[PDB]
Structure formats: C-alpha cells, structure tokens
Design a protein around this ligand. Structure first.
Ligand SMILES: [Mg+2]
Ligand SMILES: [Mg+2]
Ligand SMILES: [Mg+2]
Ligand SMILES: [Mg+2]
Ligand SMILES: [Mg+2]
Ligand SMILES: [Mg+2]
Ligand SMILES: [Mg+2]
Ligand SMILES: [Mg+2]
Ligand SMILES: [Mg+2]
Ligand SMILES: [Mg+2]
Lengths: 170, 293, 159, 205
RNA sequence: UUAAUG
RNA sequence: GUCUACGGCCAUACCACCCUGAACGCGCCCGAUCUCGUCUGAUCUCGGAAGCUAAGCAGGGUCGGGCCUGGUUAGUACUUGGAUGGGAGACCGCCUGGGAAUACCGGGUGCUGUAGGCUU
RNA sequence: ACAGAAACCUCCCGUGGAGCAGAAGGGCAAAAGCUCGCUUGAUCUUGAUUUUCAGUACGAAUACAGACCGUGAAAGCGGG
RNA sequence: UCUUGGGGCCGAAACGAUCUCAACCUAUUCUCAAACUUUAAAUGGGUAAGAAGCCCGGCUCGCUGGUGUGGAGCCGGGCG
RNA sequence: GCUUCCGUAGUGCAGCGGCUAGCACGUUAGGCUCAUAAUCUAAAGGUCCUUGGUUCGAAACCAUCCGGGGGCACCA
RNA sequence: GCCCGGAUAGCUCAGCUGUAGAGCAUCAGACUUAAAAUCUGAGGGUCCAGGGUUCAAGUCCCUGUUCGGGCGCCA
C-alpha cells in the first residue's frame, strides 16, 4: 500500500535559450519563451569574460524561465510529443531530476514568425514530492531525509509508468 | 573516484553552531540588538513582545531576559478565543488582533492597571500611542519581536502589535507596515486597516466564493459552515469578542488529573544489553558460517 | 627595532579558541557590572570595537564607571619605575568577573555565621585560615601481606 | 667543492626548512630513500636492524647518500639484489647557509642557501635494514661499513620488532593467526574492535 | 626616368 | 513520560543509515480574493483544514565516524634553583621541587530556566 | 540542442578551503561577504581615556555627553 | 573502480573482453616546520586574603523606570 | 657583488592590457624575361626567454628564475 | 602663481556668431603593359571636457585637463 504523500510529482520545468549574443537575438529568444509560456522570462548574464566565444563579463548571454504546475505539465507533454516519448539512460540524473533539449521551437506548435526566426530551447524537469518545501523555506530549514529522496531507478519507473516512454541505453 | 568532503578531519575541524540556530528558530544577530540591556540600567528588565504565527495558532508572549532563561511574564494563545466567542478563524489577522488585545488586557490585569490606560475601545485604525499619565503609575513599554517572519505590509505580527497598542502597551511603531499604507503614493488609509482588523477581507472572499461556485466555497470554508458563520455576523462577532476580552482578561489554568504514569517512549538500551547484542550477532555469524560450510 | 603598533604580536592572543568561533554568547552581554567589582580582562577578536591593549590582557582591576555598552576599569600597570593605577574604557566582550572576590565574600559570610553562632555558648572556634600543618602521627596497617619488594629494572635498549 | 662538515656538525640554529620564505634552495643528492626489494611482504623479511645515533648533531644529505651507496653495495654482494630492504629514516629538511667572501665583510651577513642537512636527535634511527633471519652478521657488517660515512658516533641495534612494524616478533605470528593484523606490503594493518561489525564480517567471511 | 648580367 | 513558544551553556547536542510515534501540538498539505513579492503563490505574505506521519520533528539503535571524559604513554619528554660532576666537544648523569602531549584501551551520546498544553 | 577542459540552467554535498581595495596576522555565514532600497554620523561643540611616552606632543583610536540627522516596523546601529 | 589517458593486444567498433602502466580514491607507513597547530607544561605575570568590611532603618535625584522599580549619594546606629 | 637595461617571425626592430602584434629583409608561389636580376602581383611565418601574480583582460604592470650588456670596485 | 600661444578627419595647419577649408594619407575610376609619377570624385571631423549669454557658439565668457615660452619664489 503506497502512501499518498509519496506521489512523485513535478516541481518545475526550467526553460532556457543560450544564444551567446546580446541584443536582437536575445530579445527574440525572450519573445520565443514569452510566446511559449505566457509570462516574461529573465535574462541571464555572464560570470567572466571568455574571448574565445565573444562574450564579456556582466553581458547578457542567455534567457530562462521556470514554469510550475499544469502549464509545465502541458509544455512537457509538448516536448515529449516532439521527442516521441523516449529518453536515454544518461539523460537521467542521480539526484532524481532529468532534462533534454529540442532542436528548434517550431516542433512545439508555435507558428513561425519571420521577424523572430528560429530558436531552440532546453528543457530541464525537476521532479518533486510533497515535503520538498522544507529545505528552501525560512522557518524550519533542514535536509529531507534518505527515504524522501528521488532516485534514478524511481525516476525511470515513474517516467515509464506515466508517459509510457521507452528508455534506451547509450 | 573523487575525494570525500566529509572526512574524519572534516568532523574534527567542524564547529557546530548554536542549538536554536541549528533548529532554525533564533536569529542571534537580531537577538543581539533586541534582548540586551544597557549596563547603566542595572538589571532593569527589558520587555519584548514576541509574536509567532504558526499554521493553526498565533502565539503572543512578553519576555524579559534573565541569565538562566528569559522568563515569560505574560502569554496569550489563539486557542483561548473560543472562550471569548471566536469558534473558528484562529490564524487570521483578526485573530492576531484579538490575541494581541488579550495579551495587553491580561498584562494590565496582572499589573493592576485595568481602569487606568483603557486604550482604544471605539477602534478606527489611526496612528495611536499610549501617553503616560501624570500622578499615576507609568505606562508599560515593550519592543516588538517578530523573529524570522518577513515584515512586509499587512502582517499578522503587526496585527498583534496593533492589538497590544489598542489594549494599552506603549510600543513605538510606524504606520507603514500596517495594511492600508499605499506603497506608491505613500499615505495611510485607516478604513482599509479597520476592514482588515474586523475581517471584511475574509467576508468579501466568502461572498466572492458564494457568488462563484458552491463547491470551491465548501472546499475553502468548511468549519465556517459548520459553526454557521455568515459575513453579516462577522463584524458583530469580533465586536462581542473584543468586549468579552476587555471584560474578563484573566486566565484560569486547567486542573491536572493524576497521571497514569506509563511510558509511551522507548527507553535507552544499556551497556550490558549492547555487549550481549554484539556477542549474539557474532555467535550468529559464526554458526551461520559453520552451517554454510 | 620593533614596531610600536596596537596589535603587534597578537597572533594567538586575541584569536578565538578551537571550535569556539562564530556568534558571541549572550550571557556575557547581559551580565550586569556594578561599581567596585573586581574584574579580570581577557581580549576577544570577534568584536573589534572597545578592545583593551595587549599589556592589559590578563590584568585585573575594578570598575569605577559604567556606560551603555562599556565600563571603565582602574587596572595597575607597571611602567619602568612604578605601578600606576590607571583607568581604561573596555567594552563588554573583553570582561569577566573574578571569583577571587567571590571566594573571599563566601569566607566572610561563613565567618559571620560562625561569629553569630557559639556566642551564647562560649566555645572559641578558630576563624583564621591556618595553613597545611605537619600531619598527625598515624598507624599504617600492613594487615595480611608483607610490603612488595621493589626491584630496579635492568637496562635494555628499546630503539 | 663545499665546506667540511666540521663547520655545520652540530645543531647551532633554529630549524630552518625550505618554505615560502626560504626559496632558491638547490636539490639534495639523496632522493631515493629506500632500495632492495621494497615490493615485498612482512612475512618474508623477519629480521630488522637499525642504526641509532648517540649524538645531537646534523648529518648531511651527502653523507646520507654515501652511506646509502655503501650499504647498497655490501647488501648486493651479500644478500643478492632481492634479499634485503634498506630504508633511510632521515629526510633532510634543514636548509643550511653559506657566507661566501668573493669587500663588505661582516656587514649584511646573512647566508644564501647552501644545502640541506638533517637534524638528528639522541636515540633516533638513521638507517634500517630488514632481511631474512639468516642474514644477521651481514647486516651488522653493512651498518658497520655505513657508520664510517657519518661523523660522530652511532650504534647498531637489532630490533625486537617484526621488520618495519611496531609489533614484536613473538606476538606477530599470534596476531596474524587471530586476524588482528593484515599484511599490507611493507607495513601492517591493525584492526581494533572499535570499527563497525560489517568490517568484522568481511574479515571473517 | 629606369634598363645590370650570361 | 512528552510537546510547543521564548531561551542559557553551545557536538555528551554534530554527521551517515535503520526502526517506532497514542493524545495535544509542530508540520507536510489546499488555493491566490484581499495585504504583499517574485520569470514562476517554489521563497515571502494572505485565506484555510480534505488527507498524512511519507518527510521535518521527537525517542531509540549502529562491536558507527566525530565529540566529551578517564587509564596507558609516563614520572617519559621537558623544566626552577645547585655543584671545583663527567666529557676535547656534542651533550649526558646526579641533588631539589614541578610535570606533559600522540598512537593504544575503557565509559557516555544532552542537562536546564519561564509560560502553556497532552497522556483528560 | 548547438556546447567542447571552459558561454547558460537545475539538483546534491559543501565550517569557509571564497570574499572583506592593498603587505601579513586576527576576525566574520539568516555576516563583517554578494545584490537591492534610502541616505551622507565622512556634520557642529565641550571635556575624559588608551597607544607611542618622559607618562610630553602629533597621528591613530576608545567610551561617554550636548545638538541636529540618516536607516529600520522597532530594538538599536552610525559621528568614515 | 571505469574517474580519465598515454603504448599495444582480439576487436569495423562497442564501460564487450583483456594483461597492464599512469595519474586519482580509500585504509596505511618514514621524516619535519622561527614566520604551522588540535593539545600543552616548568618558570612567570595580574587580583583578593576585611573597619576604606558586613547587617539594618530612612531621606535626595532634574538619571533610568509596569512597580516608595533599579542605581548612585547622604545620614543615624549595631557588629573588634 | 652592487645599480641598472634587454630577451618579440628566419635576421635586424618596433609596440599608450583590450591587435589579425607591426617595418624591412629573408622565404615560397605566380607574372615580366630567351634565362638571371631587378620589377610587378600574392603568401607563410612569432612558444611574444621561463613561472607566478594583479586584472574581467597581461607581449607590456609585479615578483622571481635563466641569458646578456654596460658602470663601479676606494685612501690609505 | 602671472601672461600668451595649441588641442580640429590617420598627419601638418586656416576658419569675421548665421555642407568647417588647403595640402599629405586611404579607397574607388583614368593613364601606362603595370607599380610608382600625375589627374578625378568619395569617405573620414566627440572642433580637449563641462557650464553660462544668445533664437542660434568651434568662435563670446569663466571653470578645469594636456603641451610649450618667458617671468616670480618668507609656510
Ligand atoms: Mg531581522
Ligand atoms: Mg484511558
Ligand atoms: Mg646562530
Ligand atoms: Mg502553495
Ligand atoms: Mg513524520
Ligand atoms: Mg516515519
Ligand atoms: Mg563511536
Ligand atoms: Mg544583514
Ligand atoms: Mg563595509
Ligand atoms: Mg550623540
């Protein structure tokens, strides 16, 4: 008999687009994330100057947005419809989370805009459990325990039971 | 392979913090500024009014520091409100106001200041402070202790603060963190503060759910339906609660029955039991190896 | 020559002990300081304001002035010809009570109790501290076994 | 070449090692501190002999090198190439200085780093040879020939320990039989009763 | 104006 | 027996894993209308009470690591004062007191102050 | 996904192994570090004390006091 | 052990297998530090060993103050 | 030993932390020529002596290392 | 400290409050078989920085930052 407080849910879906160039490309990738979600994303800037790729310190490189709830469930349903409900062994992390990246956002269902263009985006699913709000809150901080963690085997069987997704080694 | 961070050298160099810091309860940087007294005051007790908003309760206490432990001179809990006529709604802003008022009136009853320093009875929500009356014993003063609650505008800690001020505790405070203070145009609205104190936000959300759908209404408010709480009854119920609190502020403790004296806890294992356990485990491993081989 | 700085050669002295860093304990703050209490001085490196000097680290004086977050203390400094009872202003962190006064006060209270007692009786009980005397003659009872004969061990090289 | 050892024979100064402050030190001649058959077990070399000093002096790294070669040659001539194990238990860290006179003189006299030397106490092991039980007088002869490379005076003492261990030879076989010691190459592993019981079960399983 | 050699 | 709120000394209290939690509580949890703040009600704030001890938390266990406290090391290393003591020196021995610290081997694994509960 | 030893995001461990302008030492984790919001206590005036010391200055600092102020909800903190 | 790799070997190749050799990880082991340290002496440096001290009763305060609260200063006695 | 300076393609030089390191010659390739040269058009080529540090960034700024070159070495 | 000159396109210099000019340099077309020699157009101006007067300032006015040229020297 499985305890209903151990229902493995999804905490968040992390979207990011890393174009590597500030300005027009970056703001059109922000428009891509805004048309995907329905909310404004936040630009992520650099940590230090790398002269190999053409970036400088405190220069806006990427853009990202975290999505919660049924909207994150629906965008992840779109993403698995794109990637035909299959993932690899190495895509799964040992901490219990996973993620993957699509080639371009036109597969999600978004109509092409000739002003905006083509931008790919990267999914990262942070899985969840009722009782993960202890470590990040202010009142009573603490670790969540060994039984309460999500393992890689438990993530694989959750994915296979939920989305009927085949998992192939590689 | 990679190096293990938490090694024996790590546990030898590891200094633990304080117990309340490890529990995550006391902000010692705030307590350093709050609780200490100036040395030229010479054992003058420095009173703080501690507010802790729990999930189902609102604790309002008053403490002064002693070196063995800070003694609670007066305490007030939110579950004492069904004795005053608040059956349900124990963790909202109105219950915080009633708990602060109850703490204030109980402290003045224990100090013997029931008639003097009445406070606000016809409460509107304006900027009010307790002025000292000449030829009388002086007004009680204390300083607020919110703790780890983020003090934004519209906080139940400041609701308990307003309850203590209206009950007659001379606490210095600004009308900035009270609900009603606009952040943009920067003026204080006392009518919005009166609505939040008397609880018309809960009544407006009750009417909004009743207009929207009965299923979400019964999902949100269940014991309000169980104890027949209507929005027209709300303001009169809190007025009768304030009247009962200002009428009978004294607390009677519960009578203690003779304890049955049984141990629900599991007791601690002794040295002879541990030495017997390890010997039985070694003997079981040896006889299992003899049985296998 | 040496430098004449405030904290010259104070590497180990103002340093906190091992696994005793971090937040200052608060009973040290809230412990009250009356005038005329014998007070020893021990520096602390956490709070840098109100530190005493390295010549006053370890010294013991008494309080003459009390302020909001510090007290003044008259300590005895030996400077090159004489001892001067000079006054310094020290913050709360660098200050403890000396129990040399407390043991004397307990002994005074015990002597006052023993002086009020046995006055109507007439017994003369000694109140002064008498030092460790030559001990009284006693009987060593070597019952049963004889004393063990100690033999000096022969030499053998361990290394 | 360099000065005689009569100058820096005795411990005169504080211990002055190579560090962040003392830089520009030339490399010492002794770098290989053990030889013979060091890829070996504790059971196949029972006998152990030590060269124990009897003076509080400073032994130079070049003297350590010369005594190491002098012990090595006699151990190869006697016990073969794989029948002994020599170990120099004095690593030289004390950086010793030189005041070269080309005329300034004694003004500003602080030495540039000349070389390395080892601080040696009274009753401290200089060299240690572990070998079979048959090769006893050969190890005594090798340490006697190695004494001439050092100044002062030191003694040759055949230890009661089992090789390069801290346990006695009469108790070593009983401890290995009762599985309190594990052969772990040159050294030995001592298992107490303080650890968890899974280690005990892994030993007795 | 430059333009040497086999 | 035990919890909550505020604490004192800040590991005998910490860390890794496992087992049990009756009642109050503490929490996990349900939503964003109002106060409030974020890309996101995840944090904070607000309004609650369908489910739950899964987790935090409380107690206990690990021939557990760490920590605290003793023995051993050891009257050892060291050291106040002394000698027309030794030795070419290096250093060592003695008289007089004082006296350690590793490795190794035992024991323990939070007490307590104020207010308020629960086991009626 | 491009993405690689290194561009961006997330999770876990992480007693400080980072940072606090500099030389080194001490100190610091819901801070003394990083980012925000507001400010100019880096303002005026007496006295006392420490350090160097002869117990003389200068420089630096330490507690207070009288005023005007900044911030914070407040305790308080701040006169570089 | 694949956490990676230099030379091969049976491999088109494959963390499939294989002897390894290198850095890494885990238990050890030898020798040290004036500008290292968990510990830690001997010697030493402060303070106290009373009349300028206790136990009483009462006034004053513009300081601090739920509270003839706290602190300080004055008095009048008793204790040798 | 003391004080000082330099060390950049193959060679001789420049270079004001943010370059594609610059000029000449050498080199190679192609024209011109009967060939060669010269001439014309192209191109390749820097471990920026070595280590570290400051810096968002170091060919340079700071420190040491290994090379090199001058000036001093004195009255008695 | 005083007085007077300049600082304007990559470089040297003019510019009388109402597309900033002359020469060298670069690129692009002629010429020559081709460079160079010589013509032709085009590009390139933080007018040292800020403030003030005026409708409008590179210009007029002080304030400062570099660079000469001469004077003057009680902490
Ligand atoms: Mg705070
Ligand atoms: Mg019953
Ligand atoms: Mg010397
Ligand atoms: Mg929520
Ligand atoms: Mg639980
Ligand atoms: Mg459980
Ligand atoms: Mg243990
Ligand atoms: Mg802060
Ligand atoms: Mg600062
Ligand atoms: Mg002031």
């Amino acid at each position: 008999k499985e305890n209903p407080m151990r229902e493995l849910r999804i905490r968040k879906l992390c979207l990011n687009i890393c174009v590597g160039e500030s300005g027009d490309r970056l703001t059109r990738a922000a428009k891509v994330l805004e048309q995907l979600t329905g909310q404004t994303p936040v630009f992520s800037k650099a940590r230090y100057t790398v002269r190999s790729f053409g970036i400088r310190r405190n220069e806006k490189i990427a853009v990202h947005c975290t999505v919660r709830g049924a909207k994150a469930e629906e965008i992840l349903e779109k993403g698995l419809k794109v990637r035909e409900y299959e993932l690899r062994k190495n895509n799964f992390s040992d901490t219990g989370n996973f993620g993957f990246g699509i080639q371009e956002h036109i597969d999600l269902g978004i109509k092409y805009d000739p002003s905006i263009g083509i931008y790919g985006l990267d999914f990262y699913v942070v899985l969840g459990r009722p009782g993960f709000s202890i470590a990040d809150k202010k009142r009573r901080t603490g670790c969540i325990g060994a039984k309460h963690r999500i393992s890689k085997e438990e993530a694989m069987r959750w994915f296979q039971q939920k989305y009927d997704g085949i998992i192939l080694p590689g | 392979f990679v190096k293990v961070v938490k090694n024996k050298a790590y546990f030898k160099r590891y200094q633990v913090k304080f117990r309340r810091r490890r529990e995550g309860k006391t902000d010692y940087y705030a307590r350093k500024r709050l609780v200490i007294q100036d040395k030229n005051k010479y054992n003058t007790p420095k009173y703080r009014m501690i507010v802790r908003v729990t999930n189902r309760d609102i604790i309002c206490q008053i403490a002064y520091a002693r070196i063995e432990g800070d003694m609670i001179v007066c305490a007030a809990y939110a579950h004492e409100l069904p004795k005053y006529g608040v059956k349900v709604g124990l963790t909202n802003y109105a219950a915080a106001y009633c708990t602060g008022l109850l703490l204030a009136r109980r402290l003045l009853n224990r100090f013997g200041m029931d008639k003097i320093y009445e406070g606000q009875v016809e409460v509107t929500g304006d900027e009010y402070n307790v002025e000292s009356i000449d030829g009388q014993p002086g007004a009680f003063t204390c300083y607020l202790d919110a703790g780890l609650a983020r003090t934004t505008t519209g906080n139940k800690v400041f609701g308990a603060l307003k309850g203590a001020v209206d009950g007659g505790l001379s606490i210095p405070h600004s009308t900035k963190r009270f609900p009603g203070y606009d952040s943009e145009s920067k003026e204080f609205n006392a009518e919005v503060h009166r609505k939040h104190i008397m609880g018309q936000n809960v009544a407006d959300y009750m009417r909004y759910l009743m207009e929207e759908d009965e299923d979400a209404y019964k999902k949100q408010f269940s014991q309000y339906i169980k104890n027949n709480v209507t929005p027209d009854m709300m303001e009169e119920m809190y007025k009768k609660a304030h009247a009962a609190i200002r009428e009978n502020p004294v607390y009677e403790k519960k009578p203690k029955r003779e304890v049955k004296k049984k141990r629900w806890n599991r007791p601690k294992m002794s040295l002879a039991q541990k030495k017997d356990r390890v010997a039985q485990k070694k003997a079981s491993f040896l006889r299992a190896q003899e049985r296998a081989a | 020559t040496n430098t004449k700085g405030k904290r010259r050669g104070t590497r180990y002295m103002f340093s906190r002990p091992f696994r005793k860093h971090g937040v200052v304990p608060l009973a040290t703050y809230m412990r009250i300081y009356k005038k005329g209490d014998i007070v020893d001085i021990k520096g602390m490196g956490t709070v840098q304001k109100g530190m005493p000097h390295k010549c006053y680290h370890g010294k013991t004086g008494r309080v003459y002035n009390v302020t909001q977050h510090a007290v003044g203390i008259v300590v005895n400094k030996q400077v090159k010809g004489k001892i001067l009872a000079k006054r310094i202003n020290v913050r709360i962190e660098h200050i403890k009570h000396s129990k040399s006064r407390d043991s004397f006060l307990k002994r005074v209270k015990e002597n006052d109790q023993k002086k009020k007692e046995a006055k109507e009786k007439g017994t003369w009980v000694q109140l002064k501290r008498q030092p460790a005397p030559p001990r009284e003659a006693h009987f060593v009872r070597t019952n049963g076994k004889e004393p063990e004969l100690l033999e000096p061990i022969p030499y053998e090289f361990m290394a | 070449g360099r000065r005689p050892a009569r100058c820096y024979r005795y411990c005169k100064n504080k211990p002055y090692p190579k560090s962040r402050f003392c830089r520009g030190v030339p490399d010492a001649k002794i770098r290989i501190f053990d030889l013979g058959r060091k890829k070996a077990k504790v059971d196949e070399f029972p006998l152990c002999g030590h060269m124990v000093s009897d003076e509080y002096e400073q032994l130079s790294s070049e003297a350590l090198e010369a005594a190491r070669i002098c012990a090595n040659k006699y151990m190869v001539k006697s016990c073969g190439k794989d029948g002994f194990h020599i170990r120099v238990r004095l690593h030289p860290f004390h950086v010793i200085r030189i005041n070269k006179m080309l005329q300034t003189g004694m003004r500003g006299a602080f030495g540039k780093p000349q070389g390395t030397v080892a601080r040696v106490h009274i009753g401290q092991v200089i060299m240690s040879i572990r070998t079979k039980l048959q090769n006893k007088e050969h190890v005594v002869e090798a340490l006697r020939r190695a004494k001439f490379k050092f100044p002062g005076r030191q003694k040759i003492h055949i230890s009661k320990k089992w090789g390069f261990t801290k346990f006695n030879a009469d108790e070593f076989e009983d401890m290995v039989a009762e599985k309190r010691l594990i052969p772990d190459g040159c050294g030995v592993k001592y298992i107490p009763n303080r650890g968890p019981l899974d280690k005990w079960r892994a030993l007795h399983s």
